[PDB]
Amino acid sequence: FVLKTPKGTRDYSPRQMAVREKVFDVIIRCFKRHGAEVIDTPVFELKETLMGKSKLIYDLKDQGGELLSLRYDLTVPFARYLAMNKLTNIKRYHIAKVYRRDNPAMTRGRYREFYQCDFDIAGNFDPMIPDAECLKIMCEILSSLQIGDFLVKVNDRRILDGMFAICGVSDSKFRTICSSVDKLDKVSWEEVKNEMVGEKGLAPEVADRIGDYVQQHGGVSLVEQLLQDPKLSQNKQALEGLGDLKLLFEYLTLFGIDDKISFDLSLARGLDYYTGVIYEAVLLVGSVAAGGRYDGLVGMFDPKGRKVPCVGLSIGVERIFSIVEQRLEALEEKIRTTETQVLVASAQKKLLEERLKLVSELWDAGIKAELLYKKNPKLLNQLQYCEEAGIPLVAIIGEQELKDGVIKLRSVTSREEVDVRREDLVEEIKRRTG
Amino acid sequence: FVLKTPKGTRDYSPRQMAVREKVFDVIIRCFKRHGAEVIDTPVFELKETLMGDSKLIYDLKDQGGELLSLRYDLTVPFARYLAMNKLTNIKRYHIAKVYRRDYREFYQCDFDIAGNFDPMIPDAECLKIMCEILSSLQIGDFLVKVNDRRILDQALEGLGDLKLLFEYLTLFGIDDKISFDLSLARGLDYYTGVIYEAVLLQGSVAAGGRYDGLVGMFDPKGRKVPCVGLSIGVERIFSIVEQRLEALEEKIRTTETQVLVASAQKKLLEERLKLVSELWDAGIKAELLYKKNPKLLNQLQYCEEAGIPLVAIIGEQELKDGVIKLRSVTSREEVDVRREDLVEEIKRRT
């Protein structure tokens, strides 16, 4: 029996937490800015509230009561939440850990306990207004994370269904083809079309009309050409998604995100799920944030079986975590794990108690202070501490520096001292720091 | 139906989160003031990790794999963490849910100093932090009863350890708001030194103590690590804070929206969408109703039942004069400002 965290899990270190924290803040400063409420749900649900999912699910023992299972997702509790409270409309974010008993990467990428960060807008509203706001939030959050330049790929579920019908894919073969054509952003058409014909058995004449569509991508100028596409122009499903997309584009221009988006017919994911728009944000590579509209899901716990038209986004905080901490190992830099702002020190040999008086004073003034938990600390060791923890200042008490009612404030980085009076010390610290 | 949150566990409504935020904010802002690091552990540990009243533990099935169990504690994982990274010195706070089977799923809020230091300076720190928080929470008044294990047993050093703790308490200004009690003994079998417990003056509000025996556990060399900590019963505190919030007539807001963008006339959705983004690009918590042609009364009612202090109205005659009408939901008085000053005008009133 080794001391270890269970297969697929991980402790968050003080360094990692410090990085994880600055990411969440930016993400939450944005959600709050859009007037979103927040809910929280328990870690486990009734074992069978989660039926109708892949059964890569942590199930608890019996141990007495009923059968239970750790949440593999945030949205099933969400749909349980809206039903247990009889809500037809809400705007929430929810940040918590989900549990999928899958095989942990060693390269890496995948964990069994990982953060999920979702934002949602449930309810019946005018067409694409809540759909357009979700894009604005991503681009706000991503741009504010300072992690490089990004693009948002956009597509509609109906344009997919219509395109595959008018091109001629069988419904039973419909969805391994989506799973295939979705690989276009990591691979090439040649290989897609090739993997394809070997595994599907589509007519090569079905594979290559798909290619004339899915290989295309661009802006609104594309959604207008696709309307002019004669065979698409008489597919009812394709015409809706195209309509809903032209409108969606018009709103983004008003948001000033018009160019940070690309309509990409190759995008085809989460089809158990999305019924309208589908979103995915990529860096400039890798999938960093997703989302879209899913109207037939949240209401699937309602008595009379009422739809709850819902749109929303998820953010790959786990991926963004890794990027930030390497962009802080890029400068090979100490991430500050504390917010300590002053260290009460002394060079003399019996002043321990006089320090304690000063720290509580600093504390009760709302200043983040600290002292070494020893009776006669040497000033050299005291300073290394600050240098290590990135503490900006040191407050040195001396006997003949106590006598005149003052305190020595030595800046750790500039090594410069200046005598400050007890009355002005806290003011000085609150100015030499934010 | 019979849609049910698992027995012993409840959800968190937007209003409940509001209290939770304000409470945790006070807690956290104090923990950082004392320069603490923060760690996190998995929600479960190995079954054997969580061994020595103790079959109160949530366990998982057989997976085909290991035998896991949910954390009944925040301190046993602290122990495992220290033995694993091999640390003899750390100061950390941890806010996380625990999973006792008996609520069943509830929050815990530990702050622990670990290491070899001169007498009862860290032990005094914890008490100062406890008083710092209970005061700032503003939940009435409180007292802290203090004790020592070794006294309850040799019963001469706890007398002297406590003798040495009180002057530090005096230097901090905490001497008064604590008390000595010999009956306070629980909990008492992982503890080795001081044992305290917070009590509100009108419960289990806050407790903890010193325990040098609970990190030498997993350490295979058996080298014990001294550790003093505390835990704040943040669940009871959650209820009291709102109970008092409700007793103050005041609305507990669930959002932080400061301005709603409205219009009384028709065909002005586009012009509204443009404006809110400007408010958003400036970091103002603004909002907009997802209607093509909403009515100005419905939006004003949305505001007063949310706590939004302001409304930004757009009309074609305001639209054209470079002017934007700003009405205050409460006083219902009106100003119109040029588009430029608006982003700053709003920040002024909030």
Side-chain angles (χ1 to χ4, degrees), chain A residues 1-52 54-60 62 64-65 67-106 108-284 286-430 432-434, chain B:
Chain A
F1 164 60
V2 201
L3 293 184
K4 59 162 304 191
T5 65
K7 315 188 204 208
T9 68
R10 47 178 276 235
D11 298 319
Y12 288 70
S13 81
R15 205 172 73 191
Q16 293 171 297
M17 287 297 305
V19 148
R20 150 190 159 171
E21 197 190 346
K22 202 156 204 184
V23 180
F24 275 161
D25 281 329
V26 181
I27 293 179
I28 298 180
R29 266 181 45 105
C30 177
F31 287 158
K32 275 180 175 181
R33 189 178 306 113
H34 291 60
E37 301 185 300
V38 46
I39 90 172
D40 191 15
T41 79
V43 131
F44 43 66
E45 296 274 23
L46 286 171
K47 183 181 176 172
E48 195 60 0
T49 316
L50 302 156
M51 168 174 72
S54 305
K55 247 316 181 179
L56 308 143
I57 298 180
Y58 290 85
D59 282 79
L60 292 100
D62 183 18
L67 309 187
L68 293 149
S69 315
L70 311 182
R71 54 162 175 255
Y72 70 98
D73 187 24
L74 292 177
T75 38
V76 175
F78 186 42
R80 176 198 51 80
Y81 176 80
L82 289 197
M84 265 181 62
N85 291 278
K86 293 184 174 74
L87 289 173
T88 174
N89 156 45
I90 199 182
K91 182 204 302 173
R92 138 217 170 261
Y93 68 81
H94 190 182
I95 302 173
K97 293 170 190 176
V98 305
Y99 303 89
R100 292 149 80 271
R101 202 183 87 83
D102 209 320
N103 290 285
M106 331 188 59
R108 200 144 10 190
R110 294 183 313 230
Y111 280 100
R112 284 182 172 187
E113 172 201 56
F114 62 107
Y115 262 121
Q116 202 163 310
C117 171
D118 304 333
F119 171 90
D120 294 273
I121 305 180
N124 307 268
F125 315 93
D126 278 75
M128 305 301 285
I129 320 186
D131 298 78
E133 189 185 351
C134 275
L135 291 192
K136 177 62 181 194
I137 298 187
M138 277 184 19
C139 302
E140 272 190 66
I141 277 173
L142 290 184
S143 290
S144 306
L145 287 182
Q146 304 278 299
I147 59 169
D149 202 87
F150 56 84
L151 169 64
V152 189
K153 290 174 185 166
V154 138
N155 193 17
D156 192 285
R157 162 73 200 240
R158 310 183 204 102
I159 310 182
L160 260 165
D161 284 308
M163 192 176 66
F164 280 22
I166 227 70
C167 281
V169 326
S170 318
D171 285 12
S172 53
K173 326 318 184 62
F174 169 85
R175 216 184 154 165
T176 38
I177 296 327
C178 283
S179 158
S180 190
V181 302
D182 186 54
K183 301 169 183 173
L184 196 68
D185 72 332
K186 293 185 173 75
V187 208
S188 67
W189 164 246
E190 331 273 12
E191 304 173 64
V192 167
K193 174 186 178 181
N194 197 343
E195 170 210 77
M196 275 214 304
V197 188
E199 97 160 348
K200 345 112 143 179
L202 263 54
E205 340 167 70
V206 181
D208 255 333
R209 336 203 157 191
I210 299 179
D212 296 317
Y213 277 129
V214 125
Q215 287 203 244
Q216 302 209 61
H217 66 259
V220 54
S221 323
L222 177 63
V223 323
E224 231 147 54
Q225 156 184 18
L226 284 185
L227 283 169
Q228 297 305 318
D229 187 281
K231 229 56 184 140
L232 268 197
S233 305
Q234 308 235 8
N235 184 269
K236 182 189 286 188
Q237 271 188 313
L239 275 166
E240 294 192 343
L242 285 177
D244 262 341
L245 266 191
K246 179 187 176 178
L247 181 53
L248 179 65
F249 257 96
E250 184 190 332
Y251 290 161
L252 284 175
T253 321
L254 297 165
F255 281 170
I257 309 293
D258 183 34
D259 60 282
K260 234 137 186 183
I261 172 169
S262 179
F263 175 40
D264 186 17
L265 290 104
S266 82
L267 178 55
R269 307 188 174 174
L271 310 170
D272 312 79
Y273 190 60
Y274 298 114
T275 59
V277 276
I278 309 177
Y279 308 143
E280 171 174 341
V282 192
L283 289 178
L284 304 176
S287 37
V288 194
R293 170 167 296 279
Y294 53 109
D295 297 330
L297 181 57
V298 192
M300 243 182 182
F301 296 88
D302 187 81
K304 278 176 152 264
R306 307 183 188 182
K307 101 185 155 122
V308 188
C310 193
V311 80
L313 63 97
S314 46
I315 283 166
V317 294
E318 287 287 349
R319 291 229 174 87
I320 305 181
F321 285 164
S322 155
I323 303 186
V324 170
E325 55 186 3
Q326 297 199 328
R327 275 207 180 192
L328 290 186
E329 166 85 354
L331 323 179
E332 191 133 65
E333 269 177 346
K334 46 175 194 188
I335 299 93
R336 275 208 78 190
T337 57
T338 63
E339 306 199 309
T340 306
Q341 160 186 348
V342 125
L343 180 54
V344 167
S346 55
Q348 266 80 332
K349 351 303 165 185
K350 209 77 194 181
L351 267 180
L352 156 75
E353 298 142 13
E354 260 296 335
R355 295 198 300 273
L356 302 170
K357 190 215 224 105
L358 181 60
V359 197
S360 68
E361 286 200 49
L362 289 175
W363 283 335
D364 295 349
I367 286 190
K368 323 192 215 320
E370 198 168 359
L371 61 65
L372 279 193
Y373 296 139
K374 293 190 112 143
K375 291 189 294 184
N376 315 130
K378 288 189 174 184
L379 191 84
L380 173 72
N381 175 70
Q382 248 149 11
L383 267 175
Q384 303 168 198
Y385 194 84
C386 291
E387 292 163 354
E388 292 163 352
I391 302 176
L393 302 180
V394 173
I396 305 178
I397 310 179
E399 333 181 26
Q400 307 167 238
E401 313 174 303
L402 198 54
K403 111 150 191 177
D404 320 278
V406 283
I407 290 293
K408 275 204 308 188
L409 263 202
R410 181 188 298 197
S411 187
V412 171
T413 46
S414 79
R415 313 290 200 84
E416 301 179 26
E417 307 186 334
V418 145
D419 309 280
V420 190
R421 22 194 64 187
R422 279 259 193 176
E423 166 158 28
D424 310 340
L425 175 58
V426 44
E427 319 155 359
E428 171 79 354
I429 301 182
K430 240 166 250 189
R432 298 206 43 165
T433 36
Chain B
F1 199 47
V2 196
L3 283 167
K4 153 125 184 171
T5 165
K7 299 186 174 178
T9 82
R10 302 169 35 137
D11 287 317
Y12 282 81
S13 64
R15 134 168 296 178
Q16 279 160 315
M17 291 294 305
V19 162
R20 171 175 153 178
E21 281 182 30
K22 293 184 175 74
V23 167
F24 274 161
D25 193 328
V26 164
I27 303 272
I28 279 181
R29 198 184 330 166
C30 177
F31 283 164
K32 283 175 154 188
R33 188 180 301 116
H34 289 258
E37 303 170 276
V38 46
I39 86 160
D40 203 343
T41 79
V43 122
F44 45 66
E45 313 275 331
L46 299 187
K47 166 172 240 174
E48 284 183 4
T49 320
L50 305 176
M51 296 303 184
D53 178 24
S54 166
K55 250 313 180 297
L56 293 47
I57 291 181
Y58 275 98
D59 298 277
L60 293 77
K61 239 191 169 184
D62 196 27
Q63 330 310 94
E66 307 170 328
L67 311 175
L68 323 173
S69 47
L70 300 183
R71 51 186 177 189
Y72 64 93
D73 203 353
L74 218 58
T75 303
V76 171
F78 183 26
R80 182 205 48 77
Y81 180 75
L82 290 192
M84 212 173 162
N85 289 83
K86 187 52 177 174
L87 295 155
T88 82
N89 181 24
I90 200 177
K91 186 202 302 183
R92 132 201 172 279
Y93 71 83
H94 194 185
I95 293 184
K97 297 177 173 181
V98 302
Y99 295 85
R100 304 175 165 166
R101 147 172 305 253
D102 184 3
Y103 298 112
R104 277 181 165 178
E105 171 201 56
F106 59 96
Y107 263 97
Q108 209 150 55
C109 196
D110 296 73
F111 177 99
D112 319 272
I113 296 170
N116 293 266
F117 310 119
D118 276 340
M120 302 318 168
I121 317 177
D123 307 64
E125 181 110 343
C126 294
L127 296 189
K128 171 65 182 187
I129 298 181
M130 259 186 51
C131 290
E132 214 161 337
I133 291 183
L134 295 188
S135 303
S136 291
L137 285 173
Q138 299 179 293
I139 55 180
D141 304 7
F142 61 93
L143 295 171
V144 192
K145 292 186 174 74
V146 188
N147 201 338
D148 205 321
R149 165 98 187 63
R150 63 178 65 86
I151 290 182
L152 296 175
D153 292 74
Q154 178 185 305
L156 306 169
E157 309 313 356
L159 296 176
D161 287 9
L162 183 147
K163 172 182 184 284
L164 178 59
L165 164 63
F166 260 98
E167 53 275 50
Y168 300 154
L169 289 159
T170 320
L171 294 158
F172 290 153
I174 295 310
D175 45 343
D176 46 332
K177 261 161 184 175
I178 82 155
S179 167
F180 191 14
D181 199 19
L182 286 139
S183 38
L184 164 60
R186 104 158 304 130
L188 207 42
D189 309 281
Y190 272 33
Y191 292 38
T192 58
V194 185
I195 313 166
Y196 33 79
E197 201 137 297
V199 163
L200 210 161
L201 304 185
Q202 298 231 70
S204 311
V205 171
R210 179 166 287 279
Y211 59 89
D212 296 355
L214 174 41
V215 207
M217 21 188 70
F218 304 121
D219 199 317
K221 136 159 48 176
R223 195 157 163 166
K224 133 197 298 183
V225 186
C227 174
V228 58
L230 74 97
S231 66
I232 287 173
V234 83
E235 219 74 48
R236 286 206 201 192
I237 300 179
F238 280 157
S239 74
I240 306 181
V241 165
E242 182 188 11
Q243 176 207 12
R244 186 181 172 271
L245 272 185
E246 273 162 352
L248 260 67
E249 200 211 353
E250 43 182 6
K251 159 146 214 153
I252 305 178
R253 300 198 52 196
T254 60
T255 66
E256 292 180 354
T257 316
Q258 49 200 165
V259 164
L260 178 68
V261 163
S263 54
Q265 322 176 6
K266 306 179 86 87
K267 291 190 58 163
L268 278 189
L269 175 58
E270 272 80 341
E271 293 290 348
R272 291 206 303 282
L273 294 179
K274 167 171 176 173
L275 182 64
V276 199
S277 84
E278 293 183 8
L279 298 181
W280 280 338
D281 290 334
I284 286 180
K285 316 166 192 182
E287 207 166 344
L288 182 146
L289 290 200
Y290 312 118
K291 302 179 181 178
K292 62 173 189 292
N293 292 307
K295 293 164 186 145
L296 194 75
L297 176 58
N298 199 247
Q299 306 190 255
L300 278 175
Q301 280 169 18
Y302 179 77
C303 287
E304 40 202 30
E305 294 302 321
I308 307 178
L310 295 179
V311 176
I313 313 177
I314 316 179
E316 319 187 334
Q317 187 172 354
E318 299 92 290
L319 189 140
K320 260 315 184 260
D321 303 12
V323 128
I324 278 188
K325 250 160 49 184
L326 188 66
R327 189 183 295 189
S328 157
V329 176
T330 46
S331 68
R332 293 204 243 172
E333 323 206 2
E334 275 202 4
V335 202
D336 46 30
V337 212
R338 343 280 183 270
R339 265 223 171 180
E340 37 271 20
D341 303 290
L342 179 59
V343 355
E344 165 153 327
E345 166 63 26
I346 292 177
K347 292 186 96 72
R348 173 182 317 154
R349 283 167 171 247
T350 72

